[PDB]
Structure 1
Amino acid sequence: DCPPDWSSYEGHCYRFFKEWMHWDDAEEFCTEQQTGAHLVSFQSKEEADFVRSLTSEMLKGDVVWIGLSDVWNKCRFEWTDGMEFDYDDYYLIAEYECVASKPTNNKWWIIPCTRFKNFVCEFQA
């Protein structure tokens, strides 16, 4: 059973934090609440909609941090001229952006991870 201030759903526990930190602080903050916790992850749309009801006391047009980070440096690149290159030489080539959700329309925003957002944590045991 989910701790106080946590709403259950298909086995897990969630919680909307009105804290204002960056993706990293966000992710780490979650892990330091209940073992196994992380930023929220949306498997199906139903899950999303369920996390949406928890994020209602928030403004219209804002976004909450979700469990996805550094989405550009995980990519595989290539040049038009087909030039060769060793990925080790491309350590921080792209921006360090993470994903934020807009509960209203559940649209994911890929923004810089240095931005302060409200967030949602999750865990099941």
Structure 2
Amino acid sequence: DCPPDWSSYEGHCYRFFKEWMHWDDAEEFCTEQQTGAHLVSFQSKEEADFVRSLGDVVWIGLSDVWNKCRFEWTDGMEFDYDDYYLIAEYECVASKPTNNKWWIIPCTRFKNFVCEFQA
């Protein structure tokens, strides 16, 4: 149901890429493949298994996981989020097809990844 070299699963197209890029490039690269393609995203374990079926960690669709957080001081100090710019490490999520455990690591890291989309 999908293009050449890609793989199909539940109306969705996947494809591992043995190319070393940082999260943002991996993500962008995916989007430049097909209209509607992103870094793989797991909405259930099953979906993960199929991706495993396709170093040690691959980029998945989770970006800037810390700066998208809410912050609070232990003494309830009041602050203006506008002042908290890039305050936390810029980190992204990489998967380990083996144990299937996700690692939150620096987005600048170079990891192989998997793209995904729907026809």
Same fold (TM over 0.5): yes
Query: C-alpha root-mean-square deviation of aligned residues, in Å?
Result: 0.8
Distance 2:73 2:34 in 1: 44
Alignment of 1:1-125 (within 5 A): 1-54=1-54, 62-125=56-119
The Cα of 1:91 is off from its aligned counterpart by 1.4
The Cα of 1:118 is off from its aligned counterpart by 0.1
The Cα of 1:82 is off from its aligned counterpart by 0.8
Distance 2:13 2:112 in 1: 17
The Cα of 1:11 is off from its aligned counterpart by 1.0
Distance 1:44 1:10 in 2: 12
Instruction: Give the gaps of 5 or more residues in structure 2.
Output: none
Give the structure-1-normalised TM-score.
Answer: 0.93
SS at match of 2:95: strand
Distance 2:92 2:20 in 1: 15
The Cα of 1:24 is off from its aligned counterpart by 0.4
Instruction: Give the gaps of 5 or more residues in structure 1.
Output: 55-60
Give the structure-2-normalised TM-score.
Answer: 0.98
The Cα of 1:53 is off from its aligned counterpart by 0.8
Distance 1:18 1:29 in 2: 12
Percent of residue pairs bearing the same amino acid type: 100
Size of the aligned set, in residue pairs, is: 119
SS at match of 2:102: strand
The Cα of 1:81 is off from its aligned counterpart by 1.1
